[PDB]
Amino acid sequence: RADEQAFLVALYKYMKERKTPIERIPYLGFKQINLWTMFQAAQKLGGYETITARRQWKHIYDELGGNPGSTSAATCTRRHYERLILPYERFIKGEEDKPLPPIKPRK
């Protein structure tokens, strides 16, 4: 929880410096933005990559337990995620998930 919020406050500063603040991203799909939760939901449903290969947001809505009348939620949420953590999971998938650091050819 706390580290996702810290790294999305760091993104909030960087994205406001890119003319794209959270101040123009008002909702998840039935509620306020709740990024750390749609993130760990997407990471259970296979990251943004299985999501793009399968349109798996209908099962992110399953992990969200979202409102019974908001099939547009999770599906519109793709357009928020592609600017609100797709640019920042780049540090997780480029400098933590790897089996080795870049300064070596092997483990």
Side-chain angles (χ1 to χ4, degrees):
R1 188 263 175 89
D3 189 67
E4 302 96 287
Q5 289 215 256
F7 86 65
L8 244 285
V9 168
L11 180 63
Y12 166 59
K13 187 179 294 184
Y14 192 80
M15 75 192 310
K16 186 159 178 166
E17 202 172 90
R18 269 78 191 92
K19 305 181 182 179
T20 314
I22 296 177
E23 299 186 276
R24 86 192 295 176
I25 315 176
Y27 301 118
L28 176 66
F30 62 89
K31 185 171 179 179
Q32 193 206 269
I33 286 290
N34 189 30
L35 191 288
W36 73 292
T37 300
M38 60 155 124
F39 178 66
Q40 74 197 259
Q43 294 304 311
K44 190 185 304 187
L45 289 314
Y48 196 81
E49 285 171 72
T50 304
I51 259 71
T52 298
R54 300 296 301 280
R55 316 303 137 82
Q56 218 87 76
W57 289 99
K58 301 299 185 178
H59 307 246
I60 289 171
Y61 173 82
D62 194 77
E63 183 59 46
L64 297 181
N67 179 67
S70 297
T71 195
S72 51
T75 300
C76 299
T77 313
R78 184 180 173 84
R79 304 184 70 184
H80 304 146
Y81 190 109
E82 75 168 283
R83 298 296 178 281
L84 188 61
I85 192 156
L86 181 58
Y88 256 41
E89 70 167 77
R90 192 173 182 169
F91 71 72
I92 306 175
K93 201 161 64 185
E95 301 186 90
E96 192 174 270
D97 189 65
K98 289 178 176 165
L100 44 67
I103 204 166
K104 289 191 291 180
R106 295 189 296 275
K107 297 185 66 73

